[PDB]
Each structure stands twice: as structure tokens, then as C-alpha cells.
């Protein structure tokens, strides 16, 4: 595994620590979130990000950060502001970008 893979694995570990319930661990299913796939055109989650690192699909830190932001933006689009998912998405978006510097 390459230097970028090693760095991204480090960032991903640190980001996932901010989601102890694992709300962002796996793709959101329509069973858990009614109509999700018909509202969110480009789903993303931490599990998919892990698989993309292992497959060496991220060629820059910029691309990784864009998937992280996509994940958070999707949650802030689908969920109303008063939900646990919206609130956590906003919190980890800002904290995660600060952590990655």
C-alpha cells in the first residue's frame, strides 16, 4: 500500500471515531430511510470510502475529502435540521476538515 493509501487509512480511522454509533458506517438502505435512493443521487458512506482506499481509487487527498463532504452533504439534504443524523453530519463535516488540516 502506497503512501497516500496509508494517510487516507489514518484519516478514515480518525473520522470514524467521531461516529461511535456507526450511522455513517454503511450505505443508507431504503428500508432504514424511506425513499433515500430516489432523493440522494450520489450516496456515500465510510464503508464505501474504505473500499475505495483499498482499491486505490483515491489519487489525491482532495478526492478523499470530496467523498467525505458528499457523505455529510447527503445527510444534510435528506434529513431535517432537528434530526440526530443532520446534527452529526454538520458536526463531523467541520471537525473532520479541521482534523485533516
Ligand X SMILES: COc1ccc(-c2cn(C)c(=O)c3cc(C(=O)N4CCN(S(C)(=O)=O)CC4)sc23)cc1OC
Residues that bind ligand X (CB under 6 A): 23-24, 28, 32-33, 75, 78-80, 83, 85
Query: Residue-wise over 7-44: b if at least 16 C-beta within 10 A, else e?
Result: ebeebbeebbeebeeebbeeebeeeeeeebeeebeeeb
How near is the Cβ of 64 to ligand X at its closest, in Å? Answer: 19
How near is the Cβ of 22 to ligand X at its closest, in Å? Answer: 7
Q: Which is nearer to ligand X, 30 or 56 (CB)?
A: 30
Q: Which is nearer to ligand X, 15 or 75 (CB)?
A: 75
Q: Answer yes or no: are the C-beta atoms of 36 and 28 closer than 8 Å.
A: yes
Q: Which is nearer to ligand X, 3 or 81 (CB)?
A: 81
Q: Answer yes or no: are the C-beta atoms of 84 and 37 closer than 8 Å.
A: no
How near is the Cβ of 1 to ligand X at its closest, in Å? Answer: 28
- Give the CA radius of gyration of the chain: 13
Amino acid at each position: 500500500s502506497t503512501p497516500i493509501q496509508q494517510l487516507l487509512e489514518h484519516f478514515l480511522r480518525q473520522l470514524q471515531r467521531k461516529d461511535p454509533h456507526g450511522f455513517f458506517a454503511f450505505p443508507v438502505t431504503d428500508a432504514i430511510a424511506p425513499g433515500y435512493s430516489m432523493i440522494i443521487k450520489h450516496p456515500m458512506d465510510f464503508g464505501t470510502m474504505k473500499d475505495k482506499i483499498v482499491a486505490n481509487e483515491y489519487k489525491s487527498v482532495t478526492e478523499f475529502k470530496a467523498d467525505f463532504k458528499l457523505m455529510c452533504d447527503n445527510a444534510m439534504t435528506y434529513n431535517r435540521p432537528d434530526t440526530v443524523y443532520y446534527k452529526l453530519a454538520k458536526k463531523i463535516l467541520h471537525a473532520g476538515f479541521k482534523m485533516m488540516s
